Write a protein that binds this ligand. Structure first.
Ligand SMILES: *OP(=O)(O)OC[C@H]1O[C@@H](n2cnc3c(N)ncnc32)[C@H](O)[C@@H]1O
Ligand SMILES: [Mg+2]
Ligand SMILES: [Mg+2]
Ligand SMILES: [Mg+2]
Ligand SMILES: [Mg+2]
Length: 642
DNA sequence: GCTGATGCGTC
DNA sequence: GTCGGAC
DNA sequence: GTCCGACGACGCATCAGC
């Protein structure tokens, strides 16, 4: 109704009409979204973030229903449904170049300031635009910005980058107040509100519950909870929240959900949006566990099963009523074109009485000559888009462990004991092509230990543990991490541990802004008496330990690298460090690296060795660089993985 | 027609 | 993928 | 326990520059 600069979606007694900063039917100003982002990032309690976002959404619902879908995508920093594959194709380099041109500054200067500040958003908004005339263009709108993000993403092929930069410069030219900050963070893929998919869904269910869509204007019902006690209100909002969450888990597509929501309302939503083959769904996830004893603590007395945890890529296989077959990744991306070989074997895995299904499987590289699982790295050499069956060279075996839908029946609310039985009886195993995950039903600690040892001997990461009947459904909305993963490298006394030298530091971004966010590490090659970069490291240390690292490594900063340090193709550190600090580092496995020089020539002529899932464990004050893990030791640890 | 840098999606 | 912080 | 965003290696896919 006035100036969006003063918009406060965090105010007390927020009124969706009277406190909006735009008029009924008007397009939602982008500045309204930006001020909402400001108020969100100012707080740390999710519940406060959700109310703030809910207030904006209620104003959108009340005043400008068509902008709901854009505003939600801007809030998630998504371009659309994950199975459609839209991607910006920008990257820091392009974004920074656009900021340079827009502000008429040198690229190197913008790059150095972004790194120093740990944030592109502040650089893009604390500098004015040269192309801007005396008369600014019209103010940006939420849907307008979203459509421009989509335009950027749809630009492909030769000469597309320059067209992308033009759109980005136009946006920065039209920005006001804090707008440029959130445009830039969105384009860089680092919106970092502290609020994401789960909080957005909560704000959306809260908003449509309190301010129903479909009302004649002016809406008679602006706050549908005002007539309820505080406790009844909270119970009601939690129930409505679960209706939305469970539907979205089954159909994580806002293009489908939002129109239904505006037309029929939330309570009728499940009737219109149901789980079905051909629509990807959210997969069930797992929590790590320390050991067998913790497994018994979380599962108490409930019977459970242990399954090999195969080291491949999750594949959600959909067989539609009528024959069509789709395959999706754990992030709902369409991998159908990547697996022509699997699509052709579907008739061979399902009994003829199966008319439709959704299977939960692990695609694993398989050596047909040796009849043996192959490592995850081999699997990754497969082509991704538009693959022809004849050209496949790395074969895949599917390891199936769950069944989510069969013959028209959703199994989401059924216990695993029944889902597994339907999987085992209606599908056919073929060695090297499609098999059921090796499993063990027991409560005996001794058997479980031997079974965990055996899973590793059989080329697996460890064990997956799942209840059979108690809280054993596939309802992600109730618990997304219902399963437990047990790997050996989670244990304190098990796993490959290395002592590596810190040779560089990278300036932190976001939460790490103003300090180091990552470090470059090296092993010691005793033949050439050089330090060879082996991996980067950015997790495992607490906020306190990280502040100590910054204090302790600041005397070691060097203007130039030492001659006996070799990094080859690794990212050049922002700060070179005199080799001195030695840290203990844990990884899940060692891999052959196309960029790191550590141990190059000892296991492969061209490739050195790096670490899979590295994490900081502790400082090794009792170790000098000469006593750090050697490149020969690295090579020996890699060979031991057979 | 080719290549290095790098985006993007696996983990 | 692992991890720690805030709730 | 949930939710979130810091950060990791790696390989195919993509495109400015040649
Ligand atoms: O390490 P993480 O949390 O990503 O592990 C979960 C992934 O493990 C894969 N996987 C392999 N074998 C199984 C079984 N038997 N059951 C469940 N998941 C399994 C999946 O790809 C999963 O995302
Ligand atoms: Mg950097
Ligand atoms: Mg895995
Ligand atoms: Mg730690
Ligand atoms: Mg590129």
């Amino acid at each position: 109704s006035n100036d969006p600069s003063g918009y406060n979606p965090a105010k007390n007694n927020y009124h969706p009409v009277e406190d909006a900063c735009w008029k009924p039917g008007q397009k939602v100003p982008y500045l309204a979204v930006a001020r909402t982002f400001e108020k969100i990032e100012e707080v740390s309690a999710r519940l406060r973030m959700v109310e703030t976002l809910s207030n904006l959404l209620r104003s959108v619902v009340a005043l400008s229903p068509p902008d709901l879908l854009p505003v939600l995508y801007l809030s998630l920093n998504h371009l659309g449904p994950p199975q459609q594959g839209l991607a910006l194709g920008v990257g820091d380099g392009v974004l920074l170049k656009a900021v340079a041109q827009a502000t008429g500054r040198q690229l190197e200067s913008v790059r150095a300031e972004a790194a120093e500040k740990g944030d592109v958003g502040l650089v893009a908004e604390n500098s004015r635009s040269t192309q801007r005339l005396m008369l600014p263009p019209p103010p940006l709108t939420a849907s307008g910005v979203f459509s421009k993000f989509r335009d950027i993403a749809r630009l492909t092929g030769s000469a597309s980058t320059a067209k992308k930069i033009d759109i980005i410069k136009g946006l920065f030219v039209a920005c006001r107040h804090s707008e440029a900050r959130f445009i830039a963070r969105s384009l860089s893929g680092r919106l970092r509100l502290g609020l994401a998919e789960q909080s957005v869904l909560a704000a959306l269910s809260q908003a449509v519950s309190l301010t129903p869509p479909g009302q004649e204007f002016p809406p008679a019902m602006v706050d549908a909870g005002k007539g309820k006690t505080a406790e009844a209100r909270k119970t009601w909002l939690e129930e409505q929240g679960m209706i939305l969450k469970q539907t979205f888990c089954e159909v994580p597509d806002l293009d489908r959900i939002i129109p239904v929501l505006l037309e029929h309302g939330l309570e009728r939503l499940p009737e219109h949006c149901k789980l079905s083959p051909g629509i990807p769904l959210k997969p069930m996830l797992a929590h790590p566990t320390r050991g067998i004893s913790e497994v018994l603590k979380r599962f108490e007395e409930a019977a459970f099963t242990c399954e090999y945890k195969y080291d491949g890529q999750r594949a959600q296989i959909h067989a539609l009523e009528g024959g069509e077959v789709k395959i999706f990744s754990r992030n709902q991306a369409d991998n159908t074109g990547k697996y022509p070989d699997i699509i052709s074997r579907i008739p061979k895995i399902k009994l003829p009485s199966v008319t439709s299904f959704i299977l939960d499987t692990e695609a694993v590289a398989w050596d047909r000559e040796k009849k043996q699982i192959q490592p995850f790295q081999v699997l990754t050499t497969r082509k991704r888009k538009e693959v022809d069956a004849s050209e496949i060279q790395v074969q895949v075996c599917l390891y199936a462990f769950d069944l989510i839908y069969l013959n028209g029946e959703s199994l989401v609310r059924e216990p695993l004991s029944r889902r597994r039985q339907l999987l085992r009886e209606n599908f056919v195993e073929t060695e090297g092509e499609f098999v059921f995950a090796t499993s063990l039903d027991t409560k005996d600690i001794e058997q479980i230990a031997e079974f965990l040892e055996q899973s590793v001997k059989d080329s697996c990461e460890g064990l997956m543990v799942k209840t059979l009947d108690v809280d054993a459904t596939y309802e992600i909305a109730k618990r997304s991490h219902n399963w437990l993963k047990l790997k050996k490298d989670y244990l304190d006394g098990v796993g490959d541990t290395l002592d590596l030298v810190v040779i560089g530091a990278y300036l932190g971004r976001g939460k790490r802004a103003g300090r180091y966010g990552g470090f470059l590490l090296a092993s010691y090659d005793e033949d050439s008496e050089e330090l060879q970069a082996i991996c980067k490291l950015g997790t495992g240390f607490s906020d306190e330990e990280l502040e100590e690292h910054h204090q302790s490594l600041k005397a070691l900063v060097l203007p130039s690298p030492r001659p006996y340090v070799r990094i080859d193709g690794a990212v050049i550190p922002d700060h070179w460090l005199d080799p001195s600090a030695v840290w203990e580092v844990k990884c899940a496995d060692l891999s052959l690296s196309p960029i790191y020089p550590a141990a190059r020539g000892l296991v492969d002529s061209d490739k050195g060795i790096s670490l899979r899932f590295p994490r900081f464990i502790r400082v090794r004050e009792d170790k000098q660089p000469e006593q750090a893990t050697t490149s020969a030791q690295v090579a020996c640890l890699y060979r031991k993985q057979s």
